Design an enzyme around this catalytic site. Sequence first.
Site, mmCIF file in Angstrom:
data_model
loop_
_atom_site.group_PDB
_atom_site.id
_atom_site.type_symbol
_atom_site.label_atom_id
_atom_site.label_comp_id
_atom_site.label_asym_id
_atom_site.label_seq_id
_atom_site.Cartn_x
_atom_site.Cartn_y
_atom_site.Cartn_z
ATOM 1 N N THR A 262 0.844 -1.233 0.000
ATOM 2 C CA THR A 262 0.000 0.000 0.000
ATOM 3 C C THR A 262 0.859 1.255 0.000
ATOM 4 O OG1 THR A 262 -1.917 -1.007 1.117
ATOM 5 C CG2 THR A 262 -1.691 1.379 1.326
ATOM 6 N N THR A 263 0.390 2.268 -0.715
ATOM 7 C CA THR A 263 0.961 3.603 -0.646
ATOM 8 C C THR A 263 -0.177 4.615 -0.673
ATOM 9 O OG1 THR A 263 2.857 2.816 -1.950
ATOM 10 C CG2 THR A 263 2.687 5.194 -1.554
ATOM 11 N N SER B 254 3.381 0.454 2.897
ATOM 12 C CA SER B 254 4.626 -0.248 2.570
ATOM 13 C C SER B 254 5.529 0.534 1.608
ATOM 14 C CB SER B 254 4.319 -1.626 1.981
ATOM 15 O OG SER B 254 3.342 -1.534 0.962
ATOM 16 N N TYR C 177 4.406 -4.458 -3.017
ATOM 17 C CA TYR C 177 3.052 -4.546 -2.466
ATOM 18 C C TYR C 177 2.194 -3.310 -2.766
ATOM 19 C CZ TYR C 177 5.175 -8.461 0.003
ATOM 20 O OH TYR C 177 5.830 -9.635 0.303
#
Lengths: 244, 222, 240, 250, 212, 235, 231, 233
Positions: free
Chosen positions: E1-2, E131, E170
Amino acid sequence: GSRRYDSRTTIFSPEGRLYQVEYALESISHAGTAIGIMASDGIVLAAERKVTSTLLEQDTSTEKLYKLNDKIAVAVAGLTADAEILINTARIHAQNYLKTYNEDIPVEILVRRLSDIKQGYTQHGGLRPFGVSFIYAGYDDRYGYQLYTSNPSGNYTGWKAISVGANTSAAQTLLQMDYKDDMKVDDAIELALKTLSKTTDSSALTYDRLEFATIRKGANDGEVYQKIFKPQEIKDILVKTGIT
Amino acid sequence: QFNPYGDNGGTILGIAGEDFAVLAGDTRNITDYSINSRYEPKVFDCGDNIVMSANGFAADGDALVKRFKNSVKWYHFDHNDKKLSINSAARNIQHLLYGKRFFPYYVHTIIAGLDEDGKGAVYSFDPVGSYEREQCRAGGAAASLIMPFLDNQVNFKNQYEPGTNGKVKKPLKYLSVEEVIKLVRDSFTSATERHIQVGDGLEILIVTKDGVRKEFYELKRD
Amino acid sequence: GYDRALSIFSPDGHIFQVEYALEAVKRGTCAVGVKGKNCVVLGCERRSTLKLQDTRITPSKVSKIDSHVVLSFSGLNADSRILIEKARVEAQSHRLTLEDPVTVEYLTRYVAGVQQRYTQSGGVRPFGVSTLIAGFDPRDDEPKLYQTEPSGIYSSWSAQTIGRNSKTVREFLEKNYDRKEPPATVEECVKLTVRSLLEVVQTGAKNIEITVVKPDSDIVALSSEEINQYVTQIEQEKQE
Amino acid sequence: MTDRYSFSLTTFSPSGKLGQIDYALTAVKQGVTSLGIKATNGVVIATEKKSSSPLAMSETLSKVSLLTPDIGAVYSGMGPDYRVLVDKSRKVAHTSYKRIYGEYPPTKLLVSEVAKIMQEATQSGGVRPFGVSLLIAGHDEFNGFSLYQVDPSGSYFPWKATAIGKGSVAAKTFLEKRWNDELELEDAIHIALLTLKESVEGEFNGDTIELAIIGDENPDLLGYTGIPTDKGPRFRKLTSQEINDRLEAL
Amino acid sequence: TTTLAFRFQGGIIVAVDSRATAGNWVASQTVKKVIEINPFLLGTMAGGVADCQFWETWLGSQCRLHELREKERISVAAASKILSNLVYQYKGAGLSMGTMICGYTRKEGPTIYYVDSDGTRLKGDIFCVGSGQTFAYGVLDSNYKWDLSVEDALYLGKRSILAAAHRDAYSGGSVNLYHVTEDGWIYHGNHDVGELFWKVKEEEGSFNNVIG
Amino acid sequence: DRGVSTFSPEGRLFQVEYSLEAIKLGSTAIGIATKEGVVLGVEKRATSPLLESDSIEKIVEIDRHIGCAMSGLTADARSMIEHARTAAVTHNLYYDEDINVESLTQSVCDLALRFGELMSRPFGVALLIAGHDADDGYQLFHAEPSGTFYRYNAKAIGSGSEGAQAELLNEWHSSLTLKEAELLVLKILKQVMEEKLDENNAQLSCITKQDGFKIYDNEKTAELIKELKEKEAAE
Amino acid sequence: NNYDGDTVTFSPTGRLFQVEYALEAIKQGSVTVGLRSNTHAVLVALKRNADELSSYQKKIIKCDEHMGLSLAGLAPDARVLSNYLRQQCNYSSLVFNRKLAVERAGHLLCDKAQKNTQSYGGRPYGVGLLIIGYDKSGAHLLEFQPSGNVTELYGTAIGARSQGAKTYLERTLDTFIKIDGNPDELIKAGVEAISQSLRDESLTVDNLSIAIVGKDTPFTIYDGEAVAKYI
Amino acid sequence: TQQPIVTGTSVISMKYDNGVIIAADNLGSYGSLLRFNGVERLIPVGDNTVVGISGDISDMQHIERLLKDLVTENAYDNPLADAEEALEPSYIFEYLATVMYQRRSKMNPLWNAIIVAGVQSNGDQFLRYVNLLGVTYSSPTLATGFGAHMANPLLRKVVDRESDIPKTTVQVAEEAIVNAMRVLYYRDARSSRNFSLAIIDKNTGLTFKKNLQVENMKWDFAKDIKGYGTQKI
Ligand SMILES: [Mg+2]
């Protein structure tokens, strides 16, 4: 069911009065007169024991004047048993405050707490109110010497000089007449005993029918001393002031 | 130590068409290397033109489907026999699943039906209630085998138009119910070949505005 | 627990316990609230039946709920403390969760809600108290003045009085308060408040308390002499 | 079910009287006479064993009860109320004192605890007050010998000598003439037997009189030896024979 | 995830990726990581997907109740604190949440609060969570100015997610852009990373390492 | 005394019947449902001219699609509104949709009989719940402290209710416009009100599918009052 | 008189007046009629309106696919008791995969109503119910009274003027019991039965409510133009 | 959470054309110790259902009491207790299935695997499984523990799918069950020779057979087997 027998202790009359509080105050008006007088250099608590006997062990007896902590004391007017319930609570509150803040409880805070407890019994629970009126005599470093009174309603007020119990109307008029702001403890002691001596329903005011106390900064340097007078000491102060 | 969870295997597949939806699933039920049943229905008609399947731990799967069917019933009682829309059913299921956030229903739930505009709808849930409306979703044991195939054959991923060489994508033309069913069957035939927990039988529930229809197909029994 | 329904309807559609609680308020000392253009003033009667009182330590009639809101009352004194304590706790709870002090309206709505709850809960009687809640909303210079009563109804007032002889001072305020031009200054507002109490009070000595609340948590209680100057100026103009 | 009497049955009347407490005191007034007398080296509590039937064994009914090894109690009024109070008084002497401080409570504090129990029955929901007045005689190291009276209201008063119940008014007048601050225990016991004879109609002997003392430590009644600090109970109930011996010197 | 969110002259930019993974298995490329708490407030999603979804939808209900009772828009401060106080009650139970509560009110202006499942609640100008947060921070920090235009700010947020989507295994799928103004948020589309990468590489000259 | 939940010899709950008397003492509230929207209007009835009348809140929003007007012991309505709002928002949380006006009304009415020896007495207030949903369209309900709710095409509650209801009986028809309803509420309020009706002592509100629930500005209502006066003078 | 302050008090003749007053509320209520054959059971209710602007209070509630009732008296009390039945019907299905027997549903209502008549504080239910159903032993019709008395019947009627319908059914007993495999005729008999209890008013389209359950017929309520067929 | 102590092994069952057969040995093992040899693990409920239970015996006895209580309770105020409102296999199962899943959900399971075999009111065969996890499934053949691994393969050769059920007679089915019981006696170390067998037929009703023994066993070939590889004597 049970409703049939319920007195309903916590209700307003059509006039907006709390029946039980009013009747409790009527009870208290038959109790022995207690008087508090605040001076610039200390406070005086003087109270009258109710028709005692010669066989009563006076020196170990306590029905009027009680100690809440080292700084605060109370004069009781009403049911003694009711007062002791509240006194033990007040003693615990003072110790809780001391444990929490590491400082002695300010007089008003204690008075408010007890007064709030009395109030609770008039608004909820369905129980009868405490048939007690207190005179609080105390000292703290904020307001100095303070006199308060609470009654079964849970309402409290501050005083320079005050009386509870029997003949308060007559007593308060006498105090209001002779009290002055620049008065001192030794003068207040005399005023208190003179007032009781005139308002008493007894034939004569004697040592065995009195409890007496003083809260003084007459303690060695910046500190306060409570003095619950012994029977012999009450007998001496009665002679000193010229009553016996 | 007592392990409250188990894995009953199985695989399910939801595909949302333009005016229809399908929810398919194999009929094999297993523990470890043994077959419990060659025909144990996994995809259920829950009423109001909604179909549902909670794949994974069958006890939690049956419990959830049972509670949802119940929720549909009480929705009718409480709200004057109003139809539960697929989006409302989805949100309701989220609360059922998240209700056991700290002791989850060990299942991957998929529901399918029609949205309030009459278009095909598939919703997909994780074990703790997170959900999303999707066009395509495989769930369970052979999900990892089937999803890539669907990305390619339903959404035309990595497919471009000949002659342009990567410049123009293959256009996303709509699939018919007969086309979807072919992809469903080939998915399950392929999954049966390469996954030991998949096989025995394939049951497909097809949702349209006319109602729910069932179709059954034999799968390999080894 | 004691579950007895004390507050109940009568055949004529009245809750007598709530109405008798208003009779307690009628007995209470007179309180008055007047809002000027940039201030609110809370005036309160002190009955002079009680002398030998220690005015340093005796519970003041006006209480700060927060640094920007004040509450005065008429009725049972013991009852008012319970409402004040709850209001003060809620004022801090609001700051803690909303990261902003209460609006005067919100604080009034809370206190009014507590009073209402005590009119249809088992085993309890209604509060024999009506309040005047005044102050200024955070970062706002508009004066606020509200009133509550035992039934739990509340409303905003340009000026209002509660307690004994409140009918008379309301009469005074209704003819003397102009809405198009409220007391422009602190002086004018305090003067009008003292004047209104002088209709009822008796002696203008230690029987009148005045508390002036201005915007941005600027609350001050006037002393005896400051009030006595208003009392003097009012009657000297009256001798004409 | 559930105790639905969560409201006070004792309430203030318009005159400021607590009716139930007054009526409890009336019940006490009907009760058989008991009395207490404090001497310089002891206390004596005494009452009449009013036997309900001659077939009844009045030894089995104990009107004078040990509360602690140094504290004894006697009553006037309703016996059953007294019996349960003694049970509670004995327990509270342990729970609220001995289990905390490792010693028996001083007389005044045990009295305070009993008084509290009686006060609560005057205010708590769905109960009537106790219909007894207690006379608690006791000794402790720092307060010495003491004698207290506890009433249905919970109010308690320390006495040099007193009497409660049937003929209390006459008895208290009798005690006022006889008492002085130089009485020995035997002199008090003698006065007790004289005072108690006035209120008794029928038989007057050791079998119809119950009498106990708080006096000297009784190491013969301790039950064990070996610990010097433990010297035995100061409370002692006088036997039927011991009473009769003193009735000859009466 | 960002996920990221940053304050600027024109309000707030919120940008998030779309990927969701279970171990190495890419579970979804079309995850909506921006909750529309209401028409004026946005929340981002990192950590537990369910936890973020459930409790930020719930937050929307609490915010709605507030403005019904108070007849006024809830402050970003108050809205964020409702969520942080809630998750703090569940502290230790195993909630997983990293979120920016983004809004623009009259009294506050544009405001961002980082809210955490450990109970952390921080106000700030730039936040990046997930992440791939470190990759997004690099692009943000070297290009951020308060006086960015709404057009340039939107691109910066998009480019910062692309940076992370590329490097972080991810993160990826697609980029969702939002622009928060005082009159409410404005959605600025779903941008596939696969197509966005080649577009940015050519027009910007960046990613010279990669062969296109 | 007697039980709070006691039946009279006629088969009615004493307390419920007495609460209905309190509602008769309340200020007048009037609702009128049309196919263009529902209109809610109330009499403010300030007890004194110093009371700032805009602080009198007898019309209240429950949700964007549901509004409410009250009459009687208005303090009792606060917890009913709080419940209504919570129920509306909660249902949206659980089902991602607006809640049906009837369902909302039912949820409110469930509180009504939760009294005994739960709360100590019935509510002393009656509510007019007006709203819109996709299934049944524009609806107006009347929620009583008996737990009974009736749907109405037009309804008046409060002190001038039976006089107003008789007026609503004649005036209402199935083809009323929103503007006609507005003037009708204002007309009937003005009839039953003690004081002369103006924008300060009467309040209007409406619920439409497009704009949702809206309380009317005093400037907006003032124009409708002036429009009313002219049309009554027009014949 | 002195023994009607609460439910917990017997009168000197062994009567419970609060229960009898609750029974009175039912008599004030609008008339409803129940009747069955060996295949179908039918409820017919006369709905009551407040005035001409108001709706007509619903009288019939569905409890399960195979069971439901009609009410007369306090509607909120019917909501409570119907909700309880829904839960008991539901518990039977979820736990035992078994449709609740109508006789057992009557036993459960009897016992729930009884507890309210023996304890202090509470009150009897102020409503009468007519439960119909179709279970493993065929069609059924019950009559609930808030005294607790539940009674299995061929046909009955409760509410205001119900005695007229009840006499009609008592005459028609041998006819309507034989209406097997014909729902429309059984409903006709019920609509004719409830017609005996009407005065001044007649059965209109929004006045009449009808329900039916049977062998291959889920409990289904008919209102509005659906009942215009039978008017 | 517990551990099973006194345990019962395989319960095997299968459907046939008119009903169901169920069987289980009479052993109550205490670990490797073959402690109790007279334990009945098939428990009939009415004349239309037999519940076969494997796993923990103390929990089995509890379940046995629940079923006994269920019959009592069903008879209460039920004039049709021995007719239309008699307990059905499907009711008994669903009740047990509820209990099992609730108990697992409180992390305090009944440590059992249960097979409810019976015949419904309409004559339909009922055969369904439930265990300590609350997991349920149905099949033409069902078996617990070792039976799952060894009995099912043999029983599935007779009824391999739903359409084989009407072709299978009670004699063929019983033969398969009895043969399966022998195989389990050869190969399950926690089994016994003595077993009970129950047939629930829609025509002939419940036939409960006690004190059956595994017979026609093959052991003679053992005499020829010598050593473990190279040994000849
Ligand atoms: Mg396979």
